Ligand binder design. Structure first.
Ligand SMILES: FC(F)c1nnc(N2CCN(c3ncnc4sc(CC(F)(F)F)cc34)CC2)s1
Length: 463
């Protein structure tokens, strides 16, 4: 550590931690290793072990510098740079693989790999444990510790790797994904980009600079103490650090960080700041501007906010928008997280929303989503995008499980509402062949349940 990095210690409060992040973010290269160790230290003493806590776990320079020394010793001793000569100020694939193997080989042989609080360099040093994306971040922190200015974190919506090399144009796998998936460590991500899977976002993934890597570690703070309790101290810290980053411009290219900040503001708004809705919309604008509108979660964050607020119309619209993104992907093997999310929206969340709407309609509600043909159009657009996603994918998406809920959800709208949607080859155009074939069935007084099931699952025959 440099003398100027040490002058704010000891850190005695949330605001002292924010001052350290501001100071580092004002430097040429914010120090990822220092900042991750500080966040892991404070998270450990606020969420993992609160014994003796009276306000804030003071981070003394001696403690943090010792952890920093342990990390830098471990990386510098194990990775000999002279063996990997650097042309043009850029790293080689062999060097990036070496750093990734050093981190990997340091981890405990066996542990629950999706526990909370194993994301930071504090966990790596004190517990020899990291989660999947934590391994990728630790490789980028180790590379910065080694002076490898070209190695940066790459992020999709469900995975992490690194970019490096001439023009930052190379990619390398550095960590595992999911469970059971054989890992492709050391390889490029080009096969996954070429197959048009959600996991690699058709190439529209995030290439972080160092300030975005700071934003990633801030998003990675986990305030959870247990299943029903969060640390208010860590929530406040994360929220303040996200605002710092926002004010400096470093969330411009980071949709998920904007959604996380909107979620925090919903929980506890900061006076004089944008509303959660404005922030969800900025996340969607960011995805449109920098990522070809190929991200799913900007719309999912928005839908979840409208869902929690029972804005049924706007929740349906946002989930329809989610499906309009997914329709231009191929459902591939390791995309199971987004499949689980769409399955839960179609087969649990929407049905529960519409069941409540049906009860409130019975009680005299006006302006109900169930009487709005634009809402029925959003429900149809959601299923259309799911059906179009399925087209040209290796694995199928839909099955009879889904058909039961579709028939139920359609039946929540009276025929006189359903009949007002105009399906053009509210006005809606279908992209999927499944929904085009379903058109006549959708606007019938009594829903033909068996015919709908046949059309959605392309089941050839009946009993
Ligand atoms: F839109 C709603 F459904 C969501 N609510 N929380 C969502 N999250 C929680 C925050 N989150 C994230 N937030 C910021 N950055 C990243 S980078 C990343 C992929 C990986 F973990 F690095 F591998 C995930 C992620 C993942 C998605 S989506």
């Amino acid at each position: 550590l440099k003398a100027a990095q040490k002058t704010l210690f000891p850190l005695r409060s949330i605001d002292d931690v924010v001052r350290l992040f501001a100071a580092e973010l004002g430097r040429e290269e914010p120090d990822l290793v220092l900042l991750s160790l500080v966040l892991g230290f404070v998270e450990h003493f606020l969420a993992v072990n609160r014994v003796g806590l009276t306000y804030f776990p003071v981070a003394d320079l001696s403690i943090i510098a010792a952890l920093y020394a342990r990390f830098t010793a471990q990386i510098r001793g194990a990775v000999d740079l002279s063996l990997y000569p650097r042309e043009g100020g850029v790293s080689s694939r062999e060097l990036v693989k070496k750093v990734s193997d050093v981190i990997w080989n340091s981890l405990s042989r066996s542990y629950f790999k999706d526990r909370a609080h194993i994301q930071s360099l504090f966990s790596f040093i004190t517990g020899t444990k990291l989660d999947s994306s934590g391994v990728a971040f630790a490789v980028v922190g180790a590379c910065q510790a080694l002076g490898l200015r070209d190695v940066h974190l790459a992020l999709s919506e469900d995975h992490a790797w690194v970019v490096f090399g001439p023009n930052g144009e190379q990619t390398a796998e550095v960590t595992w994904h999911g469970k059971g998936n054989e890992d492709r460590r050391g390889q490029t991500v080009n096969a996954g980009v070429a197959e048009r899977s959600w996991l690699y976002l058709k190439g529209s993934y995030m290439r972080c600079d160092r300030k975005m890597e700071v934003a990633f570690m801030v998003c990675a703070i986990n305030p959870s103490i247990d299943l029903h309790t969060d640390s208010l101290e860590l929530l406040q810290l994360q929220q303040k650090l996200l605002w710092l980053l926002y004010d400096l411009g470093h969330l411009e290219r980071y949709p998920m960080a904007l959604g996380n900040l909107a979620d925090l503001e919903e929980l506890e708004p900061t006076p004089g700041r944008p509303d959660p809705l404005t922030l969800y919309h900025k996340g969607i604008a960011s995805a449109k501007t920098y990522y070809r509108d190929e991200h799913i979660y900007p719309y999912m964050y928005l839908a979840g906010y409208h869902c929690r607020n029972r804005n049924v119309r706007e929740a349906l619209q946002a989930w329809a928008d989610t499906a309009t993104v997914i329709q231009d992907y191929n459902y591939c093997r390791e995309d199971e997280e987004i499949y689980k999310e769409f399955f839960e929206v179609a087969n649990d969340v929407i049905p529960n929303l519409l069941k409540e709407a049906a009860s409130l309609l019975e009680a005299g509600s006006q302006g109900s989503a169930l009487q709005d043909p634009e809402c029925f159009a959003h429900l149809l657009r959601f299923y259309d995008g799911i059906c179009k996603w399925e087209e040209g994918s290796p694995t199928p998406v839909l099955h009879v499980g889904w058909a039961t809920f579709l028939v139920q959800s359609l039946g929540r709208f009276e025929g006189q509402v359903r009949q007002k949607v105009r399906i053009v080859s509210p006005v809606l155009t279908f992209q999927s062949e499944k929904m085009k074939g379903m058109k006549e069935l959708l606007v019938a007084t009594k829903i033909n349940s068996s015919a709908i099931k046949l059309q959605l699952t392309a089941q050839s025959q009946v009993q």
